[PDB]
Symmetry: C4
Subunit: 98 residues, 4 copies
Protein backbone atom coordinates (compact mmCIF):
# COMPACT_ATOMS: atom_id res chain seq x y z
CA UNK A 1 0.00 0.00 0.00
CA UNK A 2 1.27 3.46 1.01
CA UNK A 3 3.09 1.97 4.01
CA UNK A 4 5.41 0.29 1.52
CA UNK A 5 6.32 3.88 0.63
CA UNK A 6 6.54 4.81 4.33
CA UNK A 7 8.98 2.07 5.27
CA UNK A 8 10.64 3.03 1.98
CA UNK A 9 11.65 6.35 3.56
CA UNK A 10 13.06 4.68 6.66
CA UNK A 11 15.25 2.36 4.64
CA UNK A 12 16.16 5.19 2.27
CA UNK A 13 17.02 7.68 5.06
CA UNK A 14 19.24 5.44 7.20
CA UNK A 15 21.25 5.37 3.98
CA UNK A 16 21.41 9.16 3.59
CA UNK A 17 22.71 9.25 7.16
CA UNK A 18 25.44 6.65 6.74
CA UNK A 19 25.95 8.19 3.30
CA UNK A 20 26.33 11.83 4.31
CA UNK A 21 27.49 10.78 7.77
CA UNK A 22 30.60 9.30 6.17
CA UNK A 23 30.47 11.32 2.96
CA UNK A 24 30.59 14.42 5.19
CA UNK A 25 33.32 13.64 7.76
CA UNK A 26 35.62 13.53 4.74
CA UNK A 27 34.73 16.85 3.07
CA UNK A 28 35.05 18.40 6.54
CA UNK A 29 37.80 16.72 8.59
CA UNK A 30 41.05 18.64 8.31
CA UNK A 31 39.75 22.11 7.40
CA UNK A 32 39.94 25.07 9.85
CA UNK A 33 37.36 25.14 12.64
CA UNK A 34 36.54 21.52 11.87
CA UNK A 35 34.23 19.70 14.23
CA UNK A 36 32.96 16.80 12.14
CA UNK A 37 36.37 15.15 12.48
CA UNK A 38 35.46 11.67 13.77
CA UNK A 39 33.14 9.23 11.99
CA UNK A 40 30.91 8.70 15.09
CA UNK A 41 30.71 12.49 15.50
CA UNK A 42 29.57 13.03 11.92
CA UNK A 43 27.27 10.10 12.72
CA UNK A 44 25.56 11.78 15.66
CA UNK A 45 25.54 14.98 13.64
CA UNK A 46 23.35 13.55 10.86
CA UNK A 47 20.87 12.19 13.40
CA UNK A 48 20.69 15.65 15.01
CA UNK A 49 20.54 17.36 11.62
CA UNK A 50 18.03 15.07 9.91
CA UNK A 51 15.61 15.69 12.78
CA UNK A 52 16.19 19.44 12.66
CA UNK A 53 17.23 19.64 16.31
CA UNK A 54 20.72 21.01 15.73
CA UNK A 55 21.93 21.70 19.29
CA UNK A 56 24.87 23.16 17.46
CA UNK A 57 27.55 21.04 19.12
CA UNK A 58 28.59 19.88 15.66
CA UNK A 59 28.13 21.33 12.16
CA UNK A 60 29.95 21.90 8.86
CA UNK A 61 32.14 24.92 8.10
CA UNK A 62 33.12 23.70 4.64
CA UNK A 63 31.05 25.09 1.75
CA UNK A 64 31.19 21.50 0.56
CA UNK A 65 30.30 19.58 3.71
CA UNK A 66 27.47 22.09 4.12
CA UNK A 67 25.93 20.58 0.98
CA UNK A 68 26.00 17.16 2.61
CA UNK A 69 24.05 19.01 5.27
CA UNK A 70 21.28 20.34 3.06
CA UNK A 71 20.90 16.82 1.66
CA UNK A 72 20.74 15.27 5.12
CA UNK A 73 18.28 17.91 6.31
CA UNK A 74 15.72 17.65 3.50
CA UNK A 75 16.34 13.91 3.66
CA UNK A 76 15.12 13.63 7.23
CA UNK A 77 12.46 16.34 6.95
CA UNK A 78 10.83 14.70 3.93
CA UNK A 79 10.95 11.15 5.31
CA UNK A 80 8.98 12.05 8.42
CA UNK A 81 6.51 14.21 6.49
CA UNK A 82 5.89 11.03 4.48
CA UNK A 83 5.24 8.92 7.59
CA UNK A 84 2.89 11.74 8.58
CA UNK A 85 1.25 11.44 5.17
CA UNK A 86 0.83 7.68 5.81
CA UNK A 87 -0.90 8.21 9.16
CA UNK A 88 -2.95 10.87 7.37
CA UNK A 89 -4.47 8.58 4.72
CA UNK A 90 -4.67 5.77 7.27
CA UNK A 91 -6.94 7.95 9.43
CA UNK A 92 -8.90 8.91 6.31
CA UNK A 93 -8.91 5.26 5.26
CA UNK A 94 -10.88 4.30 8.38
CA UNK A 95 -13.21 7.28 7.91
CA UNK A 96 -13.83 6.40 4.30
CA UNK A 97 -15.32 3.27 5.86
CA UNK A 98 -17.25 4.55 8.87
CA UNK B 1 -12.21 7.45 16.03
CA UNK B 2 -8.76 8.63 14.90
CA UNK B 3 -8.59 11.08 17.82
CA UNK B 4 -8.35 8.05 20.10
CA UNK B 5 -5.10 7.44 18.23
CA UNK B 6 -4.18 11.13 18.55
CA UNK B 7 -4.56 11.32 22.30
CA UNK B 8 -2.83 7.92 22.21
CA UNK B 9 0.35 9.70 21.11
CA UNK B 10 0.11 12.30 23.87
CA UNK B 11 -0.21 9.66 26.55
CA UNK B 12 2.45 7.54 24.87
CA UNK B 13 4.95 10.42 24.46
CA UNK B 14 4.80 11.86 27.99
CA UNK B 15 6.01 8.36 28.81
CA UNK B 16 8.92 8.42 26.37
CA UNK B 17 9.95 11.70 28.02
CA UNK B 18 9.80 10.50 31.62
CA UNK B 19 11.22 7.23 30.26
CA UNK B 20 14.20 8.61 28.37
CA UNK B 21 14.27 11.68 30.63
CA UNK B 22 15.18 9.39 33.52
CA UNK B 23 16.55 6.51 31.45
CA UNK B 24 18.99 9.06 29.98
CA UNK B 25 20.28 11.03 33.00
CA UNK B 26 21.65 7.66 34.12
CA UNK B 27 23.51 6.57 30.96
CA UNK B 28 24.94 10.11 30.91
CA UNK B 29 25.58 11.46 34.43
CA UNK B 30 29.17 10.86 35.49
CA UNK B 31 30.87 10.61 32.10
CA UNK B 32 33.27 13.34 30.82
CA UNK B 33 31.66 16.52 29.49
CA UNK B 34 28.36 15.30 30.89
CA UNK B 35 25.68 17.97 31.06
CA UNK B 36 22.58 15.83 31.60
CA UNK B 37 23.53 15.31 35.24
CA UNK B 38 20.35 16.28 37.11
CA UNK B 39 16.95 14.65 36.62
CA UNK B 40 15.14 17.99 36.01
CA UNK B 41 17.85 18.89 33.48
CA UNK B 42 17.42 15.64 31.54
CA UNK B 43 13.72 16.46 31.95
CA UNK B 44 13.91 19.84 30.24
CA UNK B 45 16.24 18.25 27.69
CA UNK B 46 13.67 15.74 26.44
CA UNK B 47 11.06 18.48 26.06
CA UNK B 48 13.55 20.51 24.00
CA UNK B 49 14.66 17.43 22.07
CA UNK B 50 11.24 15.90 21.36
CA UNK B 51 10.15 19.19 19.80
CA UNK B 52 13.35 19.43 17.77
CA UNK B 53 14.26 22.86 19.17
CA UNK B 54 17.61 21.86 20.67
CA UNK B 55 18.99 25.23 21.86
CA UNK B 56 21.99 23.10 22.67
CA UNK B 57 22.22 24.01 26.35
CA UNK B 58 21.99 20.32 27.14
CA UNK B 59 22.69 17.16 25.13
CA UNK B 60 24.24 13.69 25.40
CA UNK B 61 27.94 12.95 24.87
CA UNK B 62 27.60 9.24 25.64
CA UNK B 63 27.20 6.93 22.62
CA UNK B 64 24.58 5.31 24.82
CA UNK B 65 22.62 8.30 26.07
CA UNK B 66 22.64 9.50 22.48
CA UNK B 67 20.41 6.51 21.69
CA UNK B 68 17.93 7.67 24.30
CA UNK B 69 18.08 10.82 22.24
CA UNK B 70 17.19 9.31 18.88
CA UNK B 71 14.28 7.56 20.59
CA UNK B 72 13.10 10.78 22.23
CA UNK B 73 13.45 12.68 18.96
CA UNK B 74 11.50 10.35 16.68
CA UNK B 75 9.11 9.94 19.60
CA UNK B 76 8.15 13.59 19.63
CA UNK B 77 8.43 14.10 15.88
CA UNK B 78 6.06 11.23 15.13
CA UNK B 79 3.53 12.13 17.82
CA UNK B 80 2.96 15.61 16.45
CA UNK B 81 2.88 14.40 12.86
CA UNK B 82 0.06 12.16 14.05
CA UNK B 83 -1.87 15.06 15.59
CA UNK B 84 -1.32 16.76 12.26
CA UNK B 85 -2.71 13.67 10.57
CA UNK B 86 -5.78 13.91 12.82
CA UNK B 87 -6.47 17.54 11.92
CA UNK B 88 -5.88 16.49 8.31
CA UNK B 89 -8.66 13.86 8.14
CA UNK B 90 -10.83 16.03 10.36
CA UNK B 91 -10.67 18.80 7.75
CA UNK B 92 -11.32 16.20 5.03
CA UNK B 93 -14.07 14.73 7.18
CA UNK B 94 -16.03 18.00 7.04
CA UNK B 95 -15.36 18.31 3.30
CA UNK B 96 -16.51 14.77 2.65
CA UNK B 97 -19.79 16.16 3.94
CA UNK B 98 -20.05 19.59 2.34
CA UNK C 1 -14.47 26.24 5.61
CA UNK C 2 -11.32 24.68 7.11
CA UNK C 3 -9.28 27.80 6.26
CA UNK C 4 -11.34 29.62 8.88
CA UNK C 5 -9.69 27.16 11.25
CA UNK C 6 -6.31 27.75 9.59
CA UNK C 7 -6.37 31.52 9.96
CA UNK C 8 -7.74 30.71 13.42
CA UNK C 9 -4.33 29.29 14.35
CA UNK C 10 -2.46 32.33 13.06
CA UNK C 11 -4.58 34.70 15.10
CA UNK C 12 -4.46 32.36 18.08
CA UNK C 13 -0.65 31.86 17.95
CA UNK C 14 0.42 35.51 17.62
CA UNK C 15 -1.37 35.70 20.96
CA UNK C 16 0.54 32.80 22.54
CA UNK C 17 3.71 34.62 21.49
CA UNK C 18 2.81 38.02 22.91
CA UNK C 19 1.27 36.07 25.79
CA UNK C 20 4.23 33.86 26.66
CA UNK C 21 6.63 36.43 25.21
CA UNK C 22 5.61 38.82 27.97
CA UNK C 23 4.31 36.21 30.41
CA UNK C 24 7.78 34.66 30.21
CA UNK C 25 10.19 37.63 30.50
CA UNK C 26 8.60 38.08 33.93
CA UNK C 27 8.95 34.53 35.32
CA UNK C 28 12.54 34.65 34.06
CA UNK C 29 14.05 38.15 34.38
CA UNK C 30 16.01 38.49 37.61
CA UNK C 31 16.87 34.85 38.30
CA UNK C 32 20.47 33.51 38.00
CA UNK C 33 21.74 32.85 34.48
CA UNK C 34 18.73 34.75 33.15
CA UNK C 35 18.83 35.63 29.47
CA UNK C 36 15.21 36.44 28.65
CA UNK C 37 15.60 39.74 30.54
CA UNK C 38 14.28 42.25 27.99
CA UNK C 39 10.79 42.18 26.47
CA UNK C 40 12.07 42.28 22.84
CA UNK C 41 14.48 39.44 23.70
CA UNK C 42 11.71 37.24 25.10
CA UNK C 43 9.89 38.38 21.95
CA UNK C 44 12.49 37.07 19.53
CA UNK C 45 12.79 33.99 21.73
CA UNK C 46 9.17 32.92 21.23
CA UNK C 47 9.47 33.32 17.47
CA UNK C 48 12.59 31.13 17.53
CA UNK C 49 10.97 28.67 19.94
CA UNK C 50 7.55 28.38 18.31
CA UNK C 51 9.25 27.45 15.05
CA UNK C 52 11.49 24.93 16.79
CA UNK C 53 14.70 26.55 15.51
CA UNK C 54 16.21 27.35 18.91
CA UNK C 55 19.67 28.64 17.98
CA UNK C 56 20.11 28.65 21.72
CA UNK C 57 21.03 32.33 22.06
CA UNK C 58 18.12 32.69 24.45
CA UNK C 59 16.17 30.25 26.61
CA UNK C 60 14.61 29.82 30.07
CA UNK C 61 16.49 28.56 33.13
CA UNK C 62 13.50 28.95 35.46
CA UNK C 63 11.43 25.78 36.04
CA UNK C 64 8.54 28.20 35.66
CA UNK C 65 9.50 30.11 32.54
CA UNK C 66 10.32 26.73 31.03
CA UNK C 67 6.59 25.99 31.18
CA UNK C 68 5.88 29.12 29.16
CA UNK C 69 8.29 27.45 26.77
CA UNK C 70 6.48 24.14 26.42
CA UNK C 71 3.29 26.12 25.79
CA UNK C 72 4.95 28.31 23.17
CA UNK C 73 6.53 25.27 21.51
CA UNK C 74 3.43 23.10 21.13
CA UNK C 75 1.61 26.34 20.26
CA UNK C 76 3.71 26.97 17.20
CA UNK C 77 4.19 23.31 16.28
CA UNK C 78 0.45 22.64 16.26
CA UNK C 79 -0.48 25.83 14.40
CA UNK C 80 1.70 25.00 11.42
CA UNK C 81 0.66 21.34 11.41
CA UNK C 82 -2.86 22.74 11.06
CA UNK C 83 -1.92 24.94 8.09
CA UNK C 84 -0.37 21.77 6.68
CA UNK C 85 -3.65 19.98 7.33
CA UNK C 86 -5.45 22.76 5.40
CA UNK C 87 -3.20 22.44 2.36
CA UNK C 88 -3.70 18.68 2.72
CA UNK C 89 -7.51 18.70 2.36
CA UNK C 90 -7.28 21.50 -0.17
CA UNK C 91 -5.15 19.23 -2.40
CA UNK C 92 -7.59 16.39 -1.74
CA UNK C 93 -10.46 18.79 -2.35
CA UNK C 94 -9.31 19.38 -5.93
CA UNK C 95 -8.75 15.65 -6.44
CA UNK C 96 -12.18 14.79 -5.10
CA UNK C 97 -13.28 16.80 -8.14
CA UNK C 98 -10.92 15.67 -10.89
CA UNK D 1 -2.25 18.61 -10.27
CA UNK D 2 -1.26 19.35 -6.66
CA UNK D 3 2.37 18.56 -7.43
CA UNK D 4 2.39 21.70 -9.57
CA UNK D 5 1.73 23.43 -6.25
CA UNK D 6 4.42 21.30 -4.54
CA UNK D 7 7.19 22.14 -6.97
CA UNK D 8 5.73 25.66 -6.71
CA UNK D 9 6.99 25.82 -3.11
CA UNK D 10 10.47 24.61 -4.05
CA UNK D 11 10.86 27.27 -6.71
CA UNK D 12 9.25 29.85 -4.43
CA UNK D 13 11.43 29.02 -1.40
CA UNK D 14 14.86 28.98 -3.09
CA UNK D 15 13.86 32.57 -3.81
CA UNK D 16 13.02 33.43 -0.20
CA UNK D 17 16.48 32.09 0.68
CA UNK D 18 18.44 34.07 -1.91
CA UNK D 19 16.00 36.90 -1.13
CA UNK D 20 16.37 36.97 2.64
CA UNK D 21 19.85 35.44 2.39
CA UNK D 22 20.99 38.62 0.64
CA UNK D 23 18.24 40.90 1.93
CA UNK D 24 19.42 39.92 5.42
CA UNK D 25 23.24 40.17 5.27
CA UNK D 26 22.58 43.86 4.55
CA UNK D 27 20.21 44.72 7.43
CA UNK D 28 22.68 42.88 9.66
CA UNK D 29 26.30 43.38 8.52
CA UNK D 30 27.94 46.23 10.40
CA UNK D 31 25.81 46.31 13.57
CA UNK D 32 27.23 45.24 16.98
CA UNK D 33 27.53 41.51 17.60
CA UNK D 34 26.77 40.96 13.93
CA UNK D 35 27.56 37.49 12.65
CA UNK D 36 25.65 37.48 9.37
CA UNK D 37 28.43 39.56 7.80
CA UNK D 38 29.36 37.60 4.66
CA UNK D 39 26.94 36.71 1.87
CA UNK D 40 27.80 32.95 1.97
CA UNK D 41 27.31 33.03 5.75
CA UNK D 42 23.85 34.59 5.48
CA UNK D 43 23.41 31.97 2.76
CA UNK D 44 24.13 28.99 5.00
CA UNK D 45 22.09 30.71 7.70
CA UNK D 46 18.86 30.71 5.68
CA UNK D 47 19.27 27.02 4.84
CA UNK D 48 19.75 26.29 8.56
CA UNK D 49 16.89 28.60 9.52
CA UNK D 50 14.35 27.55 6.88
CA UNK D 51 14.73 23.95 8.05
CA UNK D 52 14.39 24.95 11.69
CA UNK D 53 17.71 23.37 12.69
CA UNK D 54 19.38 26.54 13.97
CA UNK D 55 22.66 25.20 15.42
CA UNK D 56 23.04 28.78 16.51
CA UNK D 57 26.39 29.42 14.82
CA UNK D 58 24.76 32.31 12.98
CA UNK D 59 21.67 34.43 13.63
CA UNK D 60 20.39 38.02 13.52
CA UNK D 61 20.79 40.55 16.34
CA UNK D 62 19.12 43.40 14.43
CA UNK D 63 15.40 43.91 15.13
CA UNK D 64 15.23 44.32 11.37
CA UNK D 65 17.25 41.34 10.16
CA UNK D 66 15.25 39.30 12.65
CA UNK D 67 12.21 40.01 10.47
CA UNK D 68 14.01 38.54 7.47
CA UNK D 69 14.35 35.59 9.82
CA UNK D 70 10.67 35.14 10.61
CA UNK D 71 9.97 35.31 6.88
CA UNK D 72 12.67 32.73 6.10
CA UNK D 73 11.44 30.47 8.88
CA UNK D 74 7.74 30.35 7.98
CA UNK D 75 8.91 30.22 4.37
CA UNK D 76 10.71 26.95 4.82
CA UNK D 77 8.29 25.50 7.38
CA UNK D 78 5.30 26.05 5.11
CA UNK D 79 6.99 24.78 1.95
CA UNK D 80 7.78 21.40 3.44
CA UNK D 81 4.37 21.10 5.09
CA UNK D 82 3.02 21.52 1.57
CA UNK D 83 5.21 18.74 0.17
CA UNK D 84 3.89 16.69 3.08
CA UNK D 85 0.38 17.65 2.02
CA UNK D 86 1.19 16.44 -1.51
CA UNK D 87 2.40 13.05 -0.31
CA UNK D 88 -0.71 13.02 1.87
CA UNK D 89 -3.27 13.32 -0.96
CA UNK D 90 -1.08 11.15 -3.16
CA UNK D 91 -1.39 8.32 -0.62
CA UNK D 92 -5.13 9.02 -0.36
CA UNK D 93 -5.29 9.21 -4.15
CA UNK D 94 -4.14 5.59 -4.45
CA UNK D 95 -6.55 4.55 -1.70
CA UNK D 96 -9.46 6.32 -3.32
CA UNK D 97 -8.77 3.79 -6.08
CA UNK D 98 -8.07 0.56 -4.21
C1 LIG E 1 7.68 20.59 13.73
C2 LIG E 1 8.76 21.27 12.85
N1 LIG E 1 9.37 20.34 11.70
C3 LIG E 1 9.98 19.01 12.32
C4 LIG E 1 10.57 17.98 11.25
C5 LIG E 1 10.16 21.19 10.65
C6 LIG E 1 9.33 22.24 9.74
C7 LIG E 1 8.10 19.76 11.06
C8 LIG E 1 8.26 19.31 9.52
K1 LIG F 1 18.74 24.27 17.44
K1 LIG G 1 21.17 25.20 18.80
K1 LIG H 1 13.24 21.81 14.39
K1 LIG I 1 16.15 23.16 15.77
Amino acid sequence: LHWRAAGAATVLLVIVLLAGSYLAVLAERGAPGAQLITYPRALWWSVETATTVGYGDLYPVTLWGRCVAVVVMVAGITSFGLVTAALATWFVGREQER
